[PDB]
Amino acid sequence: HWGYGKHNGPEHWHKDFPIAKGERQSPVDIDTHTAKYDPSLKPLSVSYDQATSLRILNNGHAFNVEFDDSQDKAVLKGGPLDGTYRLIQFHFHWGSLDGQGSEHTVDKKKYAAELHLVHWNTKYGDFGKAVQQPDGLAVLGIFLKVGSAKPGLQKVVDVLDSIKTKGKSADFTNFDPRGLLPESLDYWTYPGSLTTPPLLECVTWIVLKEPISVSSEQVLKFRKLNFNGEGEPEELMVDNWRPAQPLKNRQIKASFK
Ligand SMILES: [Zn+2]
C-alpha cells in the first residue's frame, strides 16, 4: 500500500522496503559544481528506430508506455554502459505545480516533471532477473520544463482520458519515443536504484543535461489522472515523485566538459 499520499508516501517506504535507507538510493541532487567530467565516458547510443510500443497502462502510481522487448529493437548502449540494454517501458513523475515534480534535482532545482526510459541488460535474459543485479538496468532520465509544447508527447497526452484510473490500459502502438528526446545527449551518470518500491539498487542512471519543453496544457492533462480506481474517491495523480536521497559513497560523473 505504498503511494505518495498523506500516510504512505516516500518517507514511509522504508518500513516495507528497508533498502529505502540503503547505500545506493535514487534520486539524488546533481551538484554541477562537484560532478567531474570523465573523459573515459562514451557518447550515449540510443537506437530506437525499431521500437514497438504496444500499450499504455495506469498502474496506480504513474502510467507506463510499454514496449515489445522480445527482441533487440530499442536499445541503449555506450555511455557509461558495457553491453546492450533493451527498452521495456517509459513513465513520468510530475508535480501539482510547475515548480516541483522531478525526482533528480540540479543544484537543488526541481523541474516540472521527469521522464524515465527503462532498459534491462540483455546479458540477464529478462527484466526480472536483471533487477537482481547491480548492473541490471539503465534508466535514461530526462527533465521536463513548462514552455513550448512537445509535439512528440501529444499522442500520450491524448490517450490519458482513457486510462484515468488505476488498472486501466489502452492499445498504444506505434509510439516513437525519439520524439521525447532533447537535442543533446550530454549526461550525468551514477549508480543507483529504482525510485519506486522495491527500490532495488540495480540501476546505472543516465540523466540528460538538456530538458525538454512541454506545454502547460500538456502537463495539465497529466494532472487530471487519478491514483484511485474506477468508482473510488477521487485523488488526482500529482506529486508522484520521490525526493532526493543521500549520495553517500558515490560520485556523479559528467560526459561533457
Ligand atoms: Zn521513474
Side-chain angles (χ1 to χ4, degrees), residues 164-212:
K164 183 174 176 186
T165 50
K166 178 176 186 201
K168 301 204 148 301
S169 62
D171 292 330
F172 200 68
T173 54
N174 306 106
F175 180 73
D176 183 357
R178 292 176 290 186
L180 301 177
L181 303 176
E183 181 190 328
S184 179
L185 294 179
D186 288 352
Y187 64 87
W188 297 285
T189 185
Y190 76 97
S193 75
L194 304 179
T195 72
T196 57
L199 301 170
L200 294 171
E201 293 178 341
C202 63
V203 179
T204 302
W205 277 97
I206 301 166
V207 179
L208 299 190
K209 174 188 91 239
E210 182 173 14
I212 62 165

Short mmCIF file of all heavy atoms in Angstrom, two decimals, residues 164-212:
data_model
loop_
_atom_site.label_atom_id
_atom_site.label_comp_id
_atom_site.label_asym_id
_atom_site.label_seq_id
_atom_site.Cartn_x
_atom_site.Cartn_y
_atom_site.Cartn_z
N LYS A 164 -7.86 6.82 -17.07
CA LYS A 164 -7.90 7.79 -15.99
C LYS A 164 -7.53 7.24 -14.66
O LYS A 164 -6.91 7.90 -13.78
CB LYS A 164 -9.28 8.49 -15.86
CG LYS A 164 -9.34 9.57 -14.76
CD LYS A 164 -10.71 10.25 -14.89
CE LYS A 164 -10.87 11.24 -13.81
NZ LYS A 164 -12.23 11.87 -13.74
N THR A 165 -7.99 6.03 -14.42
CA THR A 165 -7.91 5.43 -13.13
C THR A 165 -7.07 3.96 -13.18
O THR A 165 -6.74 3.48 -14.25
CB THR A 165 -9.36 5.07 -12.60
OG1 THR A 165 -10.07 4.37 -13.58
CG2 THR A 165 -10.11 6.37 -12.26
N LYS A 166 -6.66 3.83 -11.93
CA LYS A 166 -5.73 2.66 -11.75
C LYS A 166 -6.20 1.34 -12.22
O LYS A 166 -7.43 1.06 -12.04
CB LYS A 166 -5.67 2.56 -10.26
CG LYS A 166 -4.77 1.33 -9.68
CD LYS A 166 -4.58 1.22 -8.22
CE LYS A 166 -3.59 0.09 -7.94
NZ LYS A 166 -3.68 -0.45 -6.55
N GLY A 167 -5.39 0.68 -13.05
CA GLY A 167 -5.84 -0.55 -13.58
C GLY A 167 -6.29 -0.47 -15.00
O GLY A 167 -6.54 -1.49 -15.49
N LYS A 168 -6.68 0.72 -15.41
CA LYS A 168 -6.93 0.88 -16.81
C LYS A 168 -5.77 0.82 -17.87
O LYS A 168 -4.72 1.45 -17.61
CB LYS A 168 -7.79 2.14 -17.03
CG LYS A 168 -9.12 2.19 -16.35
CD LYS A 168 -10.27 3.08 -16.90
CE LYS A 168 -11.71 2.53 -16.67
NZ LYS A 168 -12.25 1.20 -17.16
N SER A 169 -5.87 0.12 -18.92
CA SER A 169 -4.89 0.15 -20.03
C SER A 169 -5.49 0.41 -21.32
O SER A 169 -6.88 0.23 -21.42
CB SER A 169 -4.17 -1.17 -20.00
OG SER A 169 -5.04 -2.29 -20.21
N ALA A 170 -4.82 0.79 -22.39
CA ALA A 170 -5.27 1.02 -23.74
C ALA A 170 -4.18 0.67 -24.79
O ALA A 170 -2.97 0.81 -24.52
CB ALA A 170 -5.64 2.40 -23.86
N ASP A 171 -4.65 0.09 -25.85
CA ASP A 171 -3.64 -0.13 -27.01
C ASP A 171 -2.96 1.12 -27.32
O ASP A 171 -3.56 2.20 -27.29
CB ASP A 171 -4.45 -0.61 -28.28
CG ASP A 171 -5.01 -1.95 -28.11
OD1 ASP A 171 -4.47 -2.85 -27.38
OD2 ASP A 171 -6.12 -2.19 -28.66
N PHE A 172 -1.65 0.99 -27.55
CA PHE A 172 -0.82 2.19 -27.84
C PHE A 172 0.31 1.74 -28.62
O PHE A 172 1.42 1.60 -28.09
CB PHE A 172 -0.43 2.89 -26.53
CG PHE A 172 -0.02 4.27 -26.61
CD1 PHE A 172 -0.85 5.24 -26.95
CD2 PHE A 172 1.33 4.62 -26.40
CE1 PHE A 172 -0.45 6.49 -27.07
CE2 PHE A 172 1.72 5.89 -26.44
CZ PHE A 172 0.83 6.85 -26.87
N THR A 173 0.01 1.52 -29.86
CA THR A 173 1.02 1.09 -30.80
C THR A 173 1.64 2.14 -31.55
O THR A 173 1.02 3.25 -31.65
CB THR A 173 0.33 0.02 -31.72
OG1 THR A 173 -0.80 0.52 -32.28
CG2 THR A 173 -0.18 -1.18 -30.88
N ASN A 174 2.80 1.91 -32.08
CA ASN A 174 3.44 2.80 -32.98
C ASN A 174 3.87 4.15 -32.37
O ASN A 174 3.96 5.11 -33.09
CB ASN A 174 2.62 3.00 -34.23
CG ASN A 174 2.30 1.65 -34.86
OD1 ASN A 174 1.20 1.12 -34.82
ND2 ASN A 174 3.27 1.08 -35.40
N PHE A 175 4.04 4.19 -31.09
CA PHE A 175 4.53 5.44 -30.48
C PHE A 175 6.03 5.50 -30.57
O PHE A 175 6.68 4.54 -30.19
CB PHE A 175 4.09 5.50 -29.04
CG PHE A 175 4.55 6.76 -28.35
CD1 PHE A 175 3.92 8.00 -28.66
CD2 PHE A 175 5.77 6.80 -27.72
CE1 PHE A 175 4.47 9.18 -28.23
CE2 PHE A 175 6.28 8.06 -27.26
CZ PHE A 175 5.65 9.20 -27.48
N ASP A 176 6.57 6.58 -31.05
CA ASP A 176 8.01 6.74 -31.30
C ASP A 176 8.65 7.51 -30.14
O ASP A 176 8.49 8.71 -30.03
CB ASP A 176 8.22 7.49 -32.62
CG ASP A 176 9.69 7.62 -32.97
OD1 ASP A 176 10.57 7.20 -32.21
OD2 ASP A 176 9.91 7.93 -34.14
N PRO A 177 9.39 6.83 -29.23
CA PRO A 177 9.99 7.57 -28.11
C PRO A 177 11.09 8.54 -28.53
O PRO A 177 11.48 9.37 -27.71
CB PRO A 177 10.51 6.38 -27.25
CG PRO A 177 10.84 5.29 -28.25
CD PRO A 177 9.72 5.42 -29.24
N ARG A 178 11.55 8.50 -29.76
CA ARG A 178 12.53 9.53 -30.21
C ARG A 178 11.96 10.92 -30.16
O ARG A 178 12.71 11.89 -30.03
CB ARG A 178 13.00 9.23 -31.64
CG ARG A 178 13.84 7.95 -31.69
CD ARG A 178 14.24 7.58 -33.08
NE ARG A 178 13.05 7.14 -33.78
CZ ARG A 178 13.09 6.64 -34.96
NH1 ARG A 178 14.26 6.60 -35.65
NH2 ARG A 178 11.92 6.17 -35.54
N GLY A 179 10.60 11.04 -30.19
CA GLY A 179 10.00 12.30 -30.10
C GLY A 179 9.97 12.91 -28.70
O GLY A 179 9.46 14.02 -28.53
N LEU A 180 10.56 12.21 -27.72
CA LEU A 180 10.66 12.71 -26.37
C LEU A 180 12.08 13.14 -25.99
O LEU A 180 12.30 13.50 -24.83
CB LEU A 180 10.15 11.67 -25.38
CG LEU A 180 8.67 11.26 -25.62
CD1 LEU A 180 8.33 10.21 -24.64
CD2 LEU A 180 7.71 12.35 -25.48
N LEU A 181 13.01 13.05 -26.90
CA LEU A 181 14.41 13.32 -26.57
C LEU A 181 14.76 14.81 -26.85
O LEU A 181 14.25 15.41 -27.80
CB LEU A 181 15.33 12.43 -27.42
CG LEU A 181 15.08 10.93 -27.29
CD1 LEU A 181 15.99 10.19 -28.26
CD2 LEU A 181 15.31 10.47 -25.89
N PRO A 182 15.62 15.36 -26.06
CA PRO A 182 16.14 16.71 -26.36
C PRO A 182 17.21 16.59 -27.46
O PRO A 182 17.56 15.52 -27.93
CB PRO A 182 16.75 17.15 -25.05
CG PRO A 182 17.27 15.83 -24.49
CD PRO A 182 16.25 14.78 -24.87
N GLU A 183 17.68 17.75 -27.86
CA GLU A 183 18.71 17.76 -28.91
C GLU A 183 20.01 17.10 -28.49
O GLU A 183 20.57 16.28 -29.23
CB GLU A 183 18.95 19.20 -29.23
CG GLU A 183 19.93 19.53 -30.30
CD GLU A 183 20.30 21.04 -30.43
OE1 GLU A 183 19.47 21.84 -30.16
OE2 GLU A 183 21.47 21.29 -30.76
N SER A 184 20.54 17.46 -27.32
CA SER A 184 21.80 16.96 -26.84
C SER A 184 21.61 15.70 -26.02
O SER A 184 20.69 15.58 -25.22
CB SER A 184 22.45 18.00 -25.90
OG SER A 184 23.67 17.55 -25.38
N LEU A 185 22.60 14.81 -26.16
CA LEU A 185 22.68 13.58 -25.32
C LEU A 185 23.78 13.73 -24.27
O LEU A 185 24.17 12.72 -23.66
CB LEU A 185 22.84 12.32 -26.20
CG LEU A 185 21.72 11.93 -27.07
CD1 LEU A 185 22.08 10.70 -27.87
CD2 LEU A 185 20.38 11.77 -26.30
N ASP A 186 24.25 14.93 -23.97
CA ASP A 186 25.15 15.13 -22.82
C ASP A 186 24.45 14.67 -21.53
O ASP A 186 23.28 14.96 -21.35
CB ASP A 186 25.57 16.58 -22.69
CG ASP A 186 26.57 17.02 -23.79
OD1 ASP A 186 27.05 16.20 -24.57
OD2 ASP A 186 26.81 18.16 -23.90
N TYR A 187 25.21 14.02 -20.65
CA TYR A 187 24.59 13.41 -19.50
C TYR A 187 25.50 13.42 -18.28
O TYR A 187 26.71 13.53 -18.36
CB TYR A 187 24.19 11.92 -19.85
CG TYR A 187 25.32 11.02 -20.15
CD1 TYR A 187 26.00 10.32 -19.14
CD2 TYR A 187 25.75 10.84 -21.45
CE1 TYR A 187 27.06 9.53 -19.44
CE2 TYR A 187 26.80 10.01 -21.77
CZ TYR A 187 27.50 9.37 -20.76
OH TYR A 187 28.59 8.57 -20.99
N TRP A 188 24.83 13.19 -17.14
CA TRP A 188 25.46 12.78 -15.90
C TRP A 188 25.12 11.33 -15.62
O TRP A 188 24.04 10.86 -15.98
CB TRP A 188 24.92 13.62 -14.71
CG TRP A 188 25.23 15.08 -14.81
CD1 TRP A 188 26.43 15.71 -14.59
CD2 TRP A 188 24.29 16.13 -15.09
NE1 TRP A 188 26.26 17.05 -14.72
CE2 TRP A 188 24.94 17.33 -15.05
CE3 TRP A 188 22.92 16.14 -15.36
CZ2 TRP A 188 24.25 18.57 -15.23
CZ3 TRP A 188 22.26 17.34 -15.55
CH2 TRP A 188 22.90 18.48 -15.45
N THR A 189 26.03 10.63 -14.95
CA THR A 189 25.77 9.23 -14.60
C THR A 189 26.25 8.91 -13.22
O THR A 189 27.24 9.46 -12.72
CB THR A 189 26.41 8.29 -15.68
OG1 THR A 189 26.06 6.94 -15.41
CG2 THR A 189 27.92 8.38 -15.71
N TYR A 190 25.54 7.98 -12.56
CA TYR A 190 25.89 7.48 -11.27
C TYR A 190 25.14 6.18 -11.03
O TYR A 190 24.13 5.93 -11.69
CB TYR A 190 25.60 8.52 -10.18
CG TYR A 190 24.13 8.64 -9.83
CD1 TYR A 190 23.61 7.98 -8.76
CD2 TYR A 190 23.26 9.38 -10.62
CE1 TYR A 190 22.27 8.00 -8.48
CE2 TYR A 190 21.89 9.39 -10.37
CZ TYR A 190 21.39 8.68 -9.27
OH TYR A 190 20.06 8.63 -8.97
N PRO A 191 25.61 5.35 -10.09
CA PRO A 191 24.92 4.10 -9.74
C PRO A 191 23.84 4.33 -8.73
O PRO A 191 24.09 4.97 -7.71
CB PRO A 191 26.03 3.25 -9.16
CG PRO A 191 26.98 4.25 -8.50
CD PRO A 191 26.91 5.48 -9.43
N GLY A 192 22.65 3.79 -8.95
CA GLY A 192 21.59 3.96 -8.00
C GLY A 192 20.51 2.91 -8.11
O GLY A 192 20.79 1.72 -8.31
N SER A 193 19.28 3.35 -7.89
CA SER A 193 18.17 2.43 -7.59
C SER A 193 16.95 2.76 -8.41
O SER A 193 16.80 3.84 -8.97
CB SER A 193 17.82 2.47 -6.08
OG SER A 193 17.11 3.65 -5.73
N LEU A 194 16.01 1.80 -8.37
CA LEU A 194 14.62 2.14 -8.72
C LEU A 194 14.14 3.23 -7.77
O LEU A 194 14.52 3.24 -6.60
CB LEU A 194 13.73 0.92 -8.55
CG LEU A 194 14.09 -0.33 -9.29
CD1 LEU A 194 13.12 -1.46 -9.03
CD2 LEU A 194 14.19 -0.10 -10.76
N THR A 195 13.28 4.13 -8.25
CA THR A 195 12.76 5.19 -7.37
C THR A 195 11.40 4.92 -6.81
O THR A 195 10.83 5.76 -6.09
CB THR A 195 12.80 6.55 -8.06
OG1 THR A 195 11.80 6.57 -9.05
CG2 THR A 195 14.15 6.92 -8.58
N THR A 196 10.83 3.72 -7.14
CA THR A 196 9.64 3.22 -6.51
C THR A 196 9.96 1.87 -5.90
O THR A 196 10.87 1.18 -6.35
CB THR A 196 8.49 3.12 -7.52
OG1 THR A 196 8.89 2.29 -8.59
CG2 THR A 196 8.04 4.42 -7.98
N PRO A 197 9.18 1.46 -4.90
CA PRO A 197 9.31 0.08 -4.37
C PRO A 197 9.30 -0.91 -5.52
O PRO A 197 8.49 -0.79 -6.44
CB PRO A 197 8.07 -0.02 -3.50
CG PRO A 197 7.93 1.39 -2.92
CD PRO A 197 8.18 2.24 -4.13
N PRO A 198 10.19 -1.89 -5.53
CA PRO A 198 11.03 -2.32 -4.39
C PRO A 198 12.36 -1.62 -4.19
O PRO A 198 13.15 -2.07 -3.37
CB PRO A 198 11.23 -3.84 -4.69
CG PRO A 198 11.22 -3.90 -6.21
CD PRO A 198 10.18 -2.88 -6.61
N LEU A 199 12.64 -0.53 -4.90
CA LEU A 199 13.80 0.33 -4.59
C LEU A 199 15.13 -0.37 -4.77
O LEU A 199 16.15 -0.02 -4.17
CB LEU A 199 13.67 0.97 -3.21
CG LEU A 199 12.43 1.84 -2.99
CD1 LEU A 199 12.31 2.19 -1.55
CD2 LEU A 199 12.43 3.06 -3.85
N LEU A 200 15.17 -1.37 -5.66
CA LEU A 200 16.36 -2.19 -5.81
C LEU A 200 17.49 -1.42 -6.40
O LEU A 200 17.35 -0.54 -7.29
CB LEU A 200 16.02 -3.38 -6.75
CG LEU A 200 14.99 -4.36 -6.17
CD1 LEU A 200 14.54 -5.35 -7.18
CD2 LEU A 200 15.55 -5.12 -4.90
N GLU A 201 18.72 -1.73 -5.91
CA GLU A 201 19.94 -1.00 -6.28
C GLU A 201 20.58 -1.70 -7.49
O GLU A 201 21.59 -2.41 -7.38
CB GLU A 201 20.83 -0.86 -5.08
CG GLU A 201 20.22 0.02 -4.04
CD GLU A 201 20.96 0.21 -2.76
OE1 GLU A 201 21.87 -0.63 -2.44
OE2 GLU A 201 20.67 1.18 -2.02
N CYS A 202 19.93 -1.50 -8.63
CA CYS A 202 20.23 -2.21 -9.88
C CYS A 202 20.35 -1.33 -11.06
O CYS A 202 20.33 -1.83 -12.18
CB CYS A 202 19.13 -3.28 -10.15
SG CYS A 202 17.49 -2.55 -10.39
N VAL A 203 20.47 0.00 -10.86
CA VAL A 203 20.36 0.95 -11.95
C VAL A 203 21.66 1.72 -12.20
O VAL A 203 22.19 2.35 -11.29
CB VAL A 203 19.22 1.97 -11.72
CG1 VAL A 203 19.13 2.96 -12.84
CG2 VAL A 203 17.89 1.28 -11.47
N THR A 204 22.09 1.73 -13.48
CA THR A 204 23.02 2.79 -13.94
C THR A 204 22.16 3.93 -14.45
O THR A 204 21.42 3.79 -15.42
CB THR A 204 23.94 2.29 -15.04
OG1 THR A 204 24.68 1.16 -14.60
CG2 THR A 204 24.87 3.42 -15.45
N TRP A 205 22.17 5.05 -13.71
CA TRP A 205 21.42 6.24 -14.11
C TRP A 205 22.15 7.03 -15.11
O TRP A 205 23.36 7.29 -14.96
CB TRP A 205 21.13 7.09 -12.85
CG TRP A 205 19.91 6.60 -12.11
CD1 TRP A 205 19.87 5.77 -11.02
CD2 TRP A 205 18.57 6.85 -12.47
NE1 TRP A 205 18.57 5.47 -10.71
CE2 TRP A 205 17.75 6.12 -11.58
CE3 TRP A 205 17.97 7.60 -13.48
CZ2 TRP A 205 16.35 6.14 -11.66
CZ3 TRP A 205 16.61 7.65 -13.56
CH2 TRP A 205 15.80 6.94 -12.64
N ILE A 206 21.41 7.50 -16.14
CA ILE A 206 21.96 8.36 -17.18
C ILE A 206 20.96 9.53 -17.27
O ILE A 206 19.88 9.32 -17.77
CB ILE A 206 22.10 7.62 -18.49
CG1 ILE A 206 23.02 6.41 -18.32
CG2 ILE A 206 22.58 8.53 -19.60
CD1 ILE A 206 22.98 5.42 -19.46
N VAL A 207 21.33 10.67 -16.71
CA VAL A 207 20.41 11.82 -16.64
C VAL A 207 20.88 12.85 -17.62
O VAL A 207 22.00 13.35 -17.53
CB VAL A 207 20.34 12.38 -15.22
CG1 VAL A 207 19.40 13.58 -15.17
CG2 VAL A 207 19.88 11.27 -14.27
N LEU A 208 20.04 13.21 -18.61
CA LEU A 208 20.42 14.16 -19.62
C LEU A 208 20.46 15.56 -19.04
O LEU A 208 19.59 15.98 -18.28
CB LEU A 208 19.49 14.10 -20.83
CG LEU A 208 19.46 12.77 -21.56
CD1 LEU A 208 18.67 12.96 -22.90
CD2 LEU A 208 20.85 12.24 -21.87
N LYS A 209 21.46 16.34 -19.46
CA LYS A 209 21.58 17.70 -19.02
C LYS A 209 20.50 18.62 -19.61
O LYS A 209 20.05 19.55 -18.92
CB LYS A 209 22.94 18.25 -19.30
CG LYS A 209 23.11 19.72 -18.99
CD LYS A 209 24.52 20.12 -19.55
CE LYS A 209 24.73 20.69 -21.03
NZ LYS A 209 25.53 20.27 -22.32
N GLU A 210 20.09 18.41 -20.81
CA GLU A 210 19.17 19.29 -21.51
C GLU A 210 17.77 18.85 -21.26
O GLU A 210 17.40 17.68 -21.58
CB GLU A 210 19.47 19.34 -23.01
CG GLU A 210 18.56 20.28 -23.71
CD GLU A 210 18.86 20.52 -25.14
OE1 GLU A 210 19.61 19.81 -25.78
OE2 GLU A 210 18.40 21.65 -25.58
N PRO A 211 16.88 19.70 -20.69
CA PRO A 211 15.50 19.34 -20.54
C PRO A 211 14.73 19.41 -21.83
O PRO A 211 15.21 20.07 -22.79
CB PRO A 211 14.93 20.40 -19.60
CG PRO A 211 15.72 21.63 -19.95
CD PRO A 211 17.15 21.05 -20.20
N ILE A 212 13.60 18.75 -21.90
CA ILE A 212 12.63 19.02 -22.95
C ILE A 212 11.62 20.00 -22.42
O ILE A 212 11.42 20.11 -21.22
CB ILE A 212 11.99 17.74 -23.52
CG1 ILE A 212 11.20 16.95 -22.48
CG2 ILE A 212 13.05 16.87 -24.20
CD1 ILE A 212 10.25 15.88 -23.04
#
